């Protein structure tokens, strides 16, 4: 009894409120900030009457009830909102799942005004905690699935930016680098976790659990299977409740798990020493991103247990999933150089066939030839990878981006230009990210990175679906989406996208934007021109892509009255 009380005491009050504010920002993305602040604190003082003691009349109820009522205080007015009030006409029965079902991944939130440095430092110094509450509210509301205890981590680092950069010498030169590193870092976190949650609620718990044993196994090659199984259990717990919106129990369970690891390193890894001296948010972040422990040296071949034996079909018949996770454990520990996804379908094949030959004429005889159908699976990325990286070094991140923009708009023209240019820009960022690395590192690095960018495409398209091929690749099976998409070709059913004038004109506003901003606009234009002209597309493209760059460059420095743009 007394849910709030329990978690309030384990999390402490600062990030109890921080968590609860995030929760509200992610459940009702279009509620102004002051209202959210009002709700968070009424929640909080209610919470400390309930810490005062259980028998608080209303203490004993569920977090889902309490948060629900506090948002169905206001979330009932429809003219300002939408079908949101309807979730308040319902009850905890389906009201909460109504709320989750209404989260939006590309909400239409107004821009984020960026004051100059002195403005921001003064507002920070006036009331710094209003400031940081602001920061949580805006990021959470645009990333309704952002992994929360990590967001406390970023909040910490962001306010450290303001505290030290506002007493330095040059506050700009200090701050803006830090903010842009922190912004890029933050978009990575959001996307990663957006893949986890998609895995969970579109593919069930055991898909994610497989993903977890694969990835912890590559990471902790020296732990016995019991240990890894335990951690995959508990971290599954954690992401189930961070994706289910149970943010206070997601966080508390994440702290608990960090406590446990930093208590059993000897039986876990050897690269935890450093991470197990940091404060308690950094702890989880670091632990989450620690490097791969070295693999143990003389590890038995796997044919011993998984091929040569014939207690394979009966060891399997008793506990199927424990035996497969055993397999994918051993395979995965033995291959830090395999992407998680590859190993997962290696276990999927190993299964599909154990399901077949544990019944066939002679199991061992027919299932003996299994590690042969691994080799195709294992080649197909490595080659695609080495092809794509040689292309990237041949063109640099930007022109790389432009190539894949033509590529993928021609596979999937129906999809909105914004999502095309976005998803592709990040695809381009794979190149700088991974091709630096040895050809062990490259394919875990790479293929696991394309799983998340492609899922980003998937959920952006899932909210306004227009291309059937996107849907089929995003739903068949999550482990084969990168191959699926790669396998795609030009869609010829399509027809020229008419021809509009104000699509292909640039406007004078652009001289005031940042170099990155200007690039994003000219690839917006480039996907507009493929949609309008999928026909003549070899050098003609690069030709007029370069022409648009040259054209704006000339007219921005035109000293004119904008007109150079208007006439060509
Ligand atoms: C985890 C994470 C951390 C993070 O960390 C960096 C924070 C991102 C961020 C920025 N700004 C924010 C404001 C904000 C507003 C509105 N008004 N005021 C006064 C403030 C302080 C709030 Cl309330 C909350 C967050 C931000 C300033 C506006 C846009 N922008 C900016 C954006 C750009 C640009 O993108 O072009 C250039 C910018 C600034 C700020 C200065 N320069 C040069 C930022 O860098 C960012 C992200 C996405 C993530 Cl996912």
DSSP 14-44: HHHHHHHHHHHHHHSTTS-HHHHHHHHHHHH
- CA 411 to chain centroid, in Å, comes to 24
Query: CA-to-CA distance for 252 and 245, rounded, in angstroms?
Result: 13
Are 121 and 162 contacting, i.e. CB atoms less than 8 angstroms apart? yes
Most distant CA pair in the chain, distance: 84
Are residues 387 and 484 part of one domain?
yes
User: Which ligand 1 atom minimizes the distance to the CA of 514?
Assistant: 36
Domain boundary among the residues 461, 491, 521 is at 491
User: Which ligand 1 atom minimizes the distance to the CA of 131?
Assistant: 23
Q: 3: which 2 tokens?
A: 């849910």
Are 153 and 285 contacting, i.e. CB atoms less than 8 angstroms apart? yes
Query: What backbone phi and psi angles, to 5 degrees, belong to 155?
Result: -55, -45
Which residue has the least CA distance to atom 48 on ligand 1?
183
CA of 114 to the centre of ligand 1 (A): 7
- CA 552 to chain centroid, in Å, comes to 35
Residue that is written with structure tokens 């990878």 in the block? 385
The verdict on whether residue 10 carries a ligand-binding annotation is: yes
State the method. Answer: X-ray
The verdict on whether residue 3 carries a ligand-binding annotation is: yes
| 309, 371, 440 from 334: Cα distances, Å | 20, 14, 12
Query: CA-to-CA distance for 251 and 16, rounded, in angstroms?
Result: 9
Which residue has the least CA distance to atom 3 on ligand 1?
183
Query: CA-to-CA distance for 240 and 233, rounded, in angstroms?
Result: 11
Q: Please count the structural domains in the chain.
A: 6
Pocket test for ligand 1, best of 106, 110, 112, 521 (most atoms within 8 A of CB): 112
Pocket test for ligand 1, best of 25, 183, 515 (most atoms within 8 A of CB): 183
Residues contacting ligand 1 via CB (< 6 Å): 112-115, 120, 134-135, 138-139, 154, 158, 176, 179, 182-183, 186-187, 190, 514
Residue among 179, 211, 219, 218 nearest 195 (CA): 211
Are 6 and 62 contacting, i.e. CB atoms less than 8 angstroms apart? no
The residues near 296 (Cβ < 8 Å, ≥ 6 apart) are: 221, 222, 333
Q: Resolution of the deposited coordinates, in angstroms?
A: 2.7
Contacts of 209-215 with CB under 8 Å at 24 or more apart are 209/236, 209/325, 210/325, 210/328, 210/344, 210/347, 211/340, 211/344, 212/236, 213/325, 213/328, 213/329, 213/332, 214/328, 214/332, 214/340, 214/343, 214/344, 215/332, 215/340
- Alpha-carbon torsion, ordered 516, 520, 523, 529, to 10 deg: -140
Which residue has the least CA distance to atom 43 on ligand 1?
176
CA of 434 to the centre of ligand 1 (A): 27
Which residue has the least CA distance to atom 5 on ligand 1?
183
Q: 157: which 2 tokens?
A: 């680092």
Residue among 228, 256, 219, 222 nearest 241 (CA): 256
SS3 sequence of 119-165: HHHHHHHHCHHHHHHHHHHHHHHHCCCCCHHHHHHHHHHHHHHHHHH
Which residue has the least CA distance to atom 28 on ligand 1?
114
DSSP state of 275: G
Pocket test for ligand 1, best of 106, 114, 143, 521 (most atoms within 8 A of CB): 114
Q: 175: which 2 tokens?
A: 């701050």
Domain boundary among the residues 175, 194, 213 is at 194
Residue among 192, 247, 210 nearest 451 (CA): 192
Are residues 228 and 164 part of one domain?
no
Are 306 and 330 contacting, i.e. CB atoms less than 8 angstroms apart? yes
CA of 533 to the centre of ligand 1 (A): 37
Query: CA-to-CA distance for 420 and 423, rounded, in angstroms?
Result: 6
| 251, 398, 552, 567 from 555: Cα distances, Å | 53, 22, 5, 11
Query: CA-to-CA distance for 282 and 151, rounded, in angstroms?
Result: 11
Residue among 493, 523, 311 nearest 410 (CA): 493
User: Which ligand 1 atom minimizes the distance to the CA of 119?
Assistant: 19
User: Which ligand 1 atom minimizes the distance to the CA of 115?
Assistant: 19
| 286, 338, 339, 440 from 222: Cα distances, Å | 19, 17, 19, 19
Are residues 238 and 289 part of one domain?
yes
Are residues 151 and 66 part of one domain?
no
Are residues 351 and 340 part of one domain?
yes
Are residues 389 and 479 part of one domain?
yes
- CA 190 to chain centroid, in Å, comes to 5
Are residues 69 and 35 part of one domain?
yes
Q: 557: which 2 tokens?
A: 């420095």
The verdict on whether residue 237 carries a ligand-binding annotation is: yes
User: Which ligand 1 atom minimizes the distance to the CA of 112?
Assistant: 16
Q: 253: which 2 tokens?
A: 């369970």
| 124, 129, 138, 186, 515 from 117: Cα distances, Å | 10, 18, 19, 20, 20
Are 91 and 63 contacting, i.e. CB atoms less than 8 angstroms apart? no
CA of 243 to the centre of ligand 1 (A): 25
Are residues 114 and 67 part of one domain?
no
Query: CA-to-CA distance for 6 and 3, rounded, in angstroms?
Result: 5
Q: Which domain holds residue 261?
A: 202-293
3-state secondary structure of 59: coil
CATH code assigned at 144: 1.10.246.10
- Alpha-carbon torsion, ordered 160, 449, 207, 299, to 10 deg: -100
Are residues 56 and 114 part of one domain?
no
| 188, 231, 358, 526 from 193: Cα distances, Å | 9, 18, 38, 30
Are 482 and 342 contacting, i.e. CB atoms less than 8 angstroms apart? no
The verdict on whether residue 372 carries a ligand-binding annotation is: no
Are residues 498 and 415 part of one domain?
no
Query: CA-to-CA distance for 347 and 325, rounded, in angstroms?
Result: 8
Domain boundary among the residues 266, 293, 320 is at 293
Are residues 537 and 472 part of one domain?
no
Q: 107: which 2 tokens?
A: 């909400």
CB neighbours (10 Å) of residue 306? 22
- Alpha-carbon torsion, ordered 372, 377, 383, 388, to 10 deg: -170
Are residues 415 and 463 part of one domain?
yes
Q: 68: which 2 tokens?
A: 């629900």
The verdict on whether residue 241 carries a ligand-binding annotation is: yes
3-state secondary structure of 313: helix
Which residues does a gap of C–N over 2.5 Å follow in the chain? Answer: none
Which residue has the least CA distance to atom 4 on ligand 1?
183
């Amino acid at each position: 009894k007394s849910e709030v009380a329990h978690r309030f005491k384990d999390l402490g009050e600062e990030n109890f409120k921080a968590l609860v504010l995030i929760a509200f920002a992610q459940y009702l993305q279009q509620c102004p900030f002051e209202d959210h602040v009002k709700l968070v604190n009424e929640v909080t003082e209610f919470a400390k009457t309930c810490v005062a003691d259980e028998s608080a009349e209303n203490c004993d109820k569920s977090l889902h009830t309490l948060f629900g009522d506090k948002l169905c205080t206001v979330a009932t007015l429809r003219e300002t909102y939408g079908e949101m009030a309807d979730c308040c006409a319902k009850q905890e029965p389906e009201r909460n799942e109504c709320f989750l079902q209404h989260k939006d991944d590309n909400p239409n939130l107004p821009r984020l005004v960026r004051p100059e440095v002195d403005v921001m430092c003064t507002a920070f110094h006036d009331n710094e905690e209003t400031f940081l509450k602001k920061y949580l509210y805006e990021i959470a509301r645009r990333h309704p699935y952002f992994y929360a205890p990590e967001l406390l981590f970023f909040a910490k680092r962001y306010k450290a930016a303001f505290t030290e950069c506002c007493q330095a010498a040059d506050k700009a030169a200090c701050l803006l680098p830090k903010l842009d590193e922190l912004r890029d870092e933050g978009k990575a976190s959001s996307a990663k976790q957006r893949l986890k949650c998609a895995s969970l609620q579109k593919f069930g718990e055991r898909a994610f659990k497989a993903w977890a044993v694969a990835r912890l196994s590559q990471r902790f090659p020296k732990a016995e299977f019991a240990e890894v199984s335990k951690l995959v259990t508990d971290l599954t717990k954690v992401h189930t409740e961070c994706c289910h919106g149970d943010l206070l129990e997601c966080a508390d369970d994440r702290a608990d798990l960090a406590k446990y690891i930093c208590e059993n390193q000897d039986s876990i890894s050897s690269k935890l020493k450093e991470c197990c001296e940091k404060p308690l948010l950094e702890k989880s972040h670091c632990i989450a991103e620690v490097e791969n422990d070295e693999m143990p040296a003389d590890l038995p071949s796997l044919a011993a247990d998984f091929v040569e034996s014939k207690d394979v079909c009966k060891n399997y018949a008793e506990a199927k999933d424990v035996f497969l996770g055993m397999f994918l454990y051993e395979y995965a520990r033995r291959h830090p150089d395999y992407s998680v996804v590859l190993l997962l379908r290696l276990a999927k094949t190993y299964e599909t066939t154990l399901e077949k030959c544990c019944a066939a004429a002679d199991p061992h005889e027919c299932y003996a030839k299994v590690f042969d159908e691994f080799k195709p699976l294992v080649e197909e990325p490595q080659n695609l990878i080495k092809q794509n990286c040689e292309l990237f070094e041949q063109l640099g991140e930007y022109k790389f981006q432009n190539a894949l923009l033509v590529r993928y708009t021609k596979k999937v023209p129906q999809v909105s230009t914004p999502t095309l240019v976005e998803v592709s820009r990040n695809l381009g960022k794979v190149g700088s990210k991974c091709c630096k690395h040895p050809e062990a590192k490259r394919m875990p690095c790479a293929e696991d990175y394309l799983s998340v960018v492609l899922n980003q495409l998937c959920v952006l398209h899932e909210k306004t679906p227009v291309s059937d091929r996107v849907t089929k690749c995003c739903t068949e099976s999550l482990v084969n989406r990168r191959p699926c998409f790669s396998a795609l070709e030009v869609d010829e059913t399509y027809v020229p996208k008419e021809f509009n004038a104000e699509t292909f004109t640039f406007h004078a506003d652009i001289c005031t934007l940042s170099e990155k901003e200007r690039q994003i606009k000219k690839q917006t234009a480039l996907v507009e021109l493929v949609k309008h002209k999928p026909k003549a597309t070899k050098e003609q493209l690069k030709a007029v892509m370069d022409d648009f760059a040259a054209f704006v460059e000339k007219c921005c420095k035109a000293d004119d009255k904008e007109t150079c743009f208007a006439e060509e």
